[PDB]
Design a protein around this ligand. Structure first.
Ligand code: NA
Length: 421
């Protein structure tokens, strides 16, 4: 059964989908097209859940026949009731300064093998599992990686024996969430997953579904988009709100961000798909945006598509860069950057650099950041002139062979600010 545990030793920080992923978790019998599994396995580890050695051999034959990169295919043998790995698998969080853990919860649907599955996931990854006593659904959860999470109103109505404050406190204790944004549902739907209408694309970017003016959800979604555009995000700027127009219930927000690739389910028409992919491409410079057609037997649905049938897996040895950027004309008066870098592999970190460029001229220059205290690195931009334009990003490496940048995509989309002092 679900086993409640004490919460993880603090501080805790839930890991966002756009942070480094060591793998992606899918399930057999499949709910996704083989073409998607082949694309995933080209660059990333694909973990497939199977119920037996027999099913594992069936899957290996299908992957071989389809030309899947078998060197990137791993398996977990466990019973499951469904292929909605988004919804019942564990949630990832960093805790105890430099550990990666899994958070289990009471799955909100009567599928006991799905509900039990996180134990097998933690065992496979060799990480600790914590049991947060809330009725939850992964499809209805997203975090920005800076302590905010968005969920539909189901997060309170399915935990109605607790007060909202008790629900928020569990999210704080197990996932480090300091703003549990459970948004109102004016239509009070029986099922309402945030990934059907909203998606953080970055700490400062959110995609909100848009529908035609006469659709019954038109005003509710316009209100949601205005709510996010009017408020401050983790980086101190307003959210950038992007809109994916669903003319006919296309699940365009139900995408998967996996490292530098974004897999977007597409159902047509082709012009409306192209418009939606161009919103993702505009929102996420440097990323590879891939439209993915559905499998004929298990097609994408408006309320259930690619994000619902995948789950990114964090890196147990994550080389994590925590940084709040200095941006625009609001970067001063102190043009000093700070980055906290920790190795969850307990590896030796070296080097920690600021790569920067002035007025878009020449190659990026690397400067070693000063380690003022353990895990705390700084760099001051000096000798700049009024109205100079800066691009910069953070780079770190460790002796486990990990290499990371902040932002994740690195040099293709660095942080930008203007010298106003
Ligand atoms: Na569970």
């Amino acid at each position: 059964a679900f086993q409640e545990t004490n919460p993880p030793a603090g501080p805790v920080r839930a890991i966002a989908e756009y942070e480094r992923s060591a793998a992606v978790l899918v399930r057999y019998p499949f709910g996704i097209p083989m073409e998607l599994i082949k694309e995933l396995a080209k660059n990333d580890k694909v973990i497939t859940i199977v119920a037996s050695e027999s099913q594992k051999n069936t899957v290996i034959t299908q992957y071989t026949q389809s030309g899947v990169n078998l060197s990137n295919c791993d398996f977990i043998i466990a019973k499951t009731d469904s292929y909605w790995t988004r919804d019942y698998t564990g949630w990832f969080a960093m805790y105890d300064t430099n550990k990666v853990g899994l958070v289990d919860f009471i799955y909100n649907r009567p599928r006991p093998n799905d509900d039990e599955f996180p134990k097998y996931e933690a065992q496979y990854l060799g990480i600790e599992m914590f049991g947060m006593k809330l009725k939850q659904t992964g499809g209805n959860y997203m975090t920005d990686g800076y302590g905010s999470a968005v969920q539909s109103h189901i997060a309170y109505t399915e935990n109605s024996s607790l007060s909202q404050a008790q629900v928020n406190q569990k999210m704080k204790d197990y996932l480090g969430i300091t703003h549990h944004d459970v948004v109102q549902d004016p239509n009070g739907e029986y099922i309402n997953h945030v990934d059907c209408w909203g998606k953080y694309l970055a700490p400062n970017k959110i995609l909100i579904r848009k529908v035609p003016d006469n659709h019954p959800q038109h005003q509710a979604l316009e209100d949601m988009a205005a709510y996010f555009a009017a408020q401050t995000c983790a980086w101190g700027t307003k959210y950038e709100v992007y809109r994916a127009l669903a003319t006919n219930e296309q699940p365009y927000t139900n995408s998967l961000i996996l490292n530098n690739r974004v897999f977007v389910p597409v159902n047509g028409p082709a012009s409306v798909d192209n418009d939606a992919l161009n919103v993702y491409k505009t929102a996420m410079p440097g990323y590879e945006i891939i439209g993915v057609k559905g499998a004929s037997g298990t097609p994408w649905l408006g309320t259930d598509a690619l994000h619902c049938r995948t789950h990114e897996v964090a890196d147990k040895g994550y080389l994590y860069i925590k940084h709040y950027p200095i941006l625009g004309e609001q970067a001063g008066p102190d043009y000093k950057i700070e980055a906290d870098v920790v190795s969850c592999a307990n590896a030796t970190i070296s080097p920690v650099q600021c790569y920067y460029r002035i007025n878009g001229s020449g190659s990026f220059k690397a400067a070693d950041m000063t380690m003022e205290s353990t895990g705390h690195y700084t760099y001051s931009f000096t000798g700049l002139n009024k109205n100079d334009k800066v691009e910069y990003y953070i780079s770190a490496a460790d002796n486990s062979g990990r290499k990371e940048t902040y932002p994740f995509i690195g040099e293709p989309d660095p942080f930008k600010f203007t010298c106003m002092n």
